[PDB]
Enzyme design. Structure first.
Site, PDB file in Angstrom:
ATOM      1  N   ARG A 121      10.567  72.108  22.094  1.00  0.00           N
ATOM      2  CA  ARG A 121       9.359  71.839  22.482  1.00  0.00           C
ATOM      3  C   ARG A 121       8.532  70.878  20.774  1.00  0.00           C
ATOM      4  O   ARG A 121       9.077  70.348  20.605  1.00  0.00           O
ATOM      5  CB  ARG A 121       8.566  72.812  22.244  1.00  0.00           C
ATOM      6  CG  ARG A 121       8.389  73.914  22.932  1.00  0.00           C
ATOM      7  CD  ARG A 121       7.408  75.041  23.052  1.00  0.00           C
ATOM      8  NE  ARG A 121       6.979  76.129  23.293  1.00  0.00           N
ATOM      9  CZ  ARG A 121       5.652  76.941  22.336  1.00  0.00           C
ATOM     10  NH1 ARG A 121       5.462  76.324  22.228  1.00  0.00           N
ATOM     11  NH2 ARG A 121       5.904  78.424  21.622  1.00  0.00           N
ATOM     12  N   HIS A 122       7.489  69.796  21.150  1.00  0.00           N
ATOM     13  CA  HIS A 122       6.825  69.501  20.534  1.00  0.00           C
ATOM     14  C   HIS A 122       6.163  70.047  18.662  1.00  0.00           C
ATOM     15  O   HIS A 122       6.333  71.159  18.645  1.00  0.00           O
ATOM     16  CB  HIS A 122       5.226  68.942  20.772  1.00  0.00           C
ATOM     17  CG  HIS A 122       4.819  70.327  21.397  1.00  0.00           C
ATOM     18  ND1 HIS A 122       4.434  70.966  20.316  1.00  0.00           N
ATOM     19  CD2 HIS A 122       4.774  70.111  22.206  1.00  0.00           C
ATOM     20  CE1 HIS A 122       3.611  72.066  20.701  1.00  0.00           C
ATOM     21  NE2 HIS A 122       3.781  72.138  22.517  1.00  0.00           N
TER      22      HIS A 122
ATOM     23  N   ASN B 158      -2.021  73.957  19.175  1.00  0.00           N
ATOM     24  CA  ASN B 158      -0.839  75.644  18.542  1.00  0.00           C
ATOM     25  C   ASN B 158      -1.591  76.456  17.466  1.00  0.00           C
ATOM     26  O   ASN B 158      -2.115  78.148  17.628  1.00  0.00           O
ATOM     27  CB  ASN B 158       0.140  75.706  18.449  1.00  0.00           C
ATOM     28  CG  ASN B 158       0.938  75.198  19.584  1.00  0.00           C
ATOM     29  OD1 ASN B 158       0.923  73.549  19.747  1.00  0.00           O
ATOM     30  ND2 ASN B 158       0.616  75.605  20.893  1.00  0.00           N
TER      31      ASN B 158
ATOM     32  N   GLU C 115       3.189  69.283  30.462  1.00  0.00           N
ATOM     33  CA  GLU C 115       3.257  70.706  30.634  1.00  0.00           C
ATOM     34  C   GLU C 115       2.387  71.662  31.413  1.00  0.00           C
ATOM     35  O   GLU C 115       1.282  71.407  32.122  1.00  0.00           O
ATOM     36  CB  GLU C 115       2.372  71.795  28.916  1.00  0.00           C
ATOM     37  CG  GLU C 115       2.049  73.067  29.020  1.00  0.00           C
ATOM     38  CD  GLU C 115       3.871  73.749  28.758  1.00  0.00           C
ATOM     39  OE1 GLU C 115       3.961  73.265  29.797  1.00  0.00           O
ATOM     40  OE2 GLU C 115       3.992  74.729  27.922  1.00  0.00           O
TER      41      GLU C 115
HETATM   42  O1  LIG Z   1       0.730  77.224  26.974  1.00  0.00           O
HETATM   43  C1  LIG Z   1       1.208  78.402  27.649  1.00  0.00           C
HETATM   44  C2  LIG Z   1       2.386  78.783  28.835  1.00  0.00           C
HETATM   45  O2  LIG Z   1       3.190  78.870  27.983  1.00  0.00           O
HETATM   46  C3  LIG Z   1       2.097  79.890  29.572  1.00  0.00           C
HETATM   47  O3  LIG Z   1       3.208  80.771  29.414  1.00  0.00           O
HETATM   48  P1  LIG Z   1       2.776  81.821  28.116  1.00  0.00           P
HETATM   49  O4  LIG Z   1       2.892  83.262  29.194  1.00  0.00           O
HETATM   50  O5  LIG Z   1       3.432  82.030  27.224  1.00  0.00           O
HETATM   51  O6  LIG Z   1       0.981  82.241  28.346  1.00  0.00           O
END
Ligand SMILES: O=C[C@@H](O)COP(=O)(O)O
Ligand SMILES: O=C[C@@H](O)COP(=O)(O)O
Lengths: 191, 191
Positions: free
Chosen positions: A8-9, A15, A78
């Site tokens: 990932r970035h 984040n 994304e």
């Molecule tokens: O941007 C988050 C995505 O990876 C959705 O998956 P998650 O269940 O970890 O939130």
């Protein structure tokens, strides 16, 4: 043999703020990772590598540290959380308790209002997987959801397992596809 | 007929930052909810309403706005995230990747390193439920995991359903225990 490195970035501003999606930049330590990634790739002793990113600032900025050219794929963007973009989980739970709960019953096929599902993302990635299968050493600097879909393909994971696949930040997954199946190696870049 | 009013504390600072656990105070609009709750409670014209809160600042502060006296229960404190206390979900995925994956396996019995599980929570709430049962009108201003367990009991939910119950912020859940089970009324207080 050739390897495909998925990661990932570097850690983004959103984040850091517990928010999802968006198009923010890299945090202070997010950039530290980009550089650490550059050194990792260097330590691998590769002669020719194809670096792919998405149209998001966070993947691009990560690539910028590598010092080498990279290709921007829109399909590596994304998953679109729709109306829930840039929100925290609590914020989603409060204002969209119906949707949130619906997602938990079928996280693979559920779409937030005006958003994509995991299933949508998979179909969207077909061309990327196809190209990936006919290339040599490639580094894919993408996102959690995207990374999960690619990772599910190379490791024969069911749609049910996919959305829960382990995909932490600052962790490089070295995939080595072979006759059948693919070798995996997780490398965490502590920064 | 007697009614149990289950609700969470007002939006806390960590809630605003998407971090779990801890003991932060209410945010700006967190207080607005406390006030909005005070209004809703008065308008309900409840007869001798008993008010319970946990030993956490966030629940106490919410009850302060009520004006009427409240009682603090240590047994109503939020689930202990253990070593993952105050971290964001990303931080958890990155620094405790295996643990995070082990969670969804069995979310009812899974504990973070040195943390609690939904089962431990159910246990320390037994006395709370006994008292809650031998009462008339009570308003419990607690937490998300806690609220889920109380809600789980009154709505006759299974241990598998429990950890995934809808328990958003700024929302009062009026439970009216009746013969056929329990009637539910959700009152969202938009602030
Ligand atoms: O941007 C988050 C995505 O990876 C959705 O998956 P998650 O269940 O970890 O939130
Ligand atoms: O502090 C959060 C607790 O409610 C744990 O349950 P969760 O899966 O909703 O995060």
């Amino acid at each position: 043999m050739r390897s495909i490195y998925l990661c990932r970035h570097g850690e983004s501003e959103l984040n850091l703020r517990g928010r999802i999606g968006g198009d923010s930049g890299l945090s202070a330590r997010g950039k530290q990772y980009a550089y650490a990634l550059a050194n990792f790739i260097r330590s691998q002793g590769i002669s020719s590598l194809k670096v792919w990113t998405s149209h998001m600032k966070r993947t691009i900025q990560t690539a910028e540290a590598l010092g080498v050219p990279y290709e921007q794929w829109k399909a590596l963007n994304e998953i679109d959380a729709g109306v829930c973009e840039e929100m925290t989980y609590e914020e989603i739970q409060e204002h969209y308790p119906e949707e949130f709960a619906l997602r938990d019953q079928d996280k693979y096929r559920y779409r937030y209002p005006k958003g994509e599902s995991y299933e949508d993302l998979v179909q969207r990635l077909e061309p990327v997987i196809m190209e990936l299968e006919r290339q040599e050493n490639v580094l894919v600097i993408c996102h959690q959801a995207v990374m999960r879909c690619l990772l599910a393909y190379f490791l024969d994971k069911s749609s049910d397992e996919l959305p829960y696949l382990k995909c932490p930040l600052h962790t490089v997954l070295k995939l080595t596809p072979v006759a059948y199946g693919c070798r995996v190696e997780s490398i965490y870049l502590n920064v």
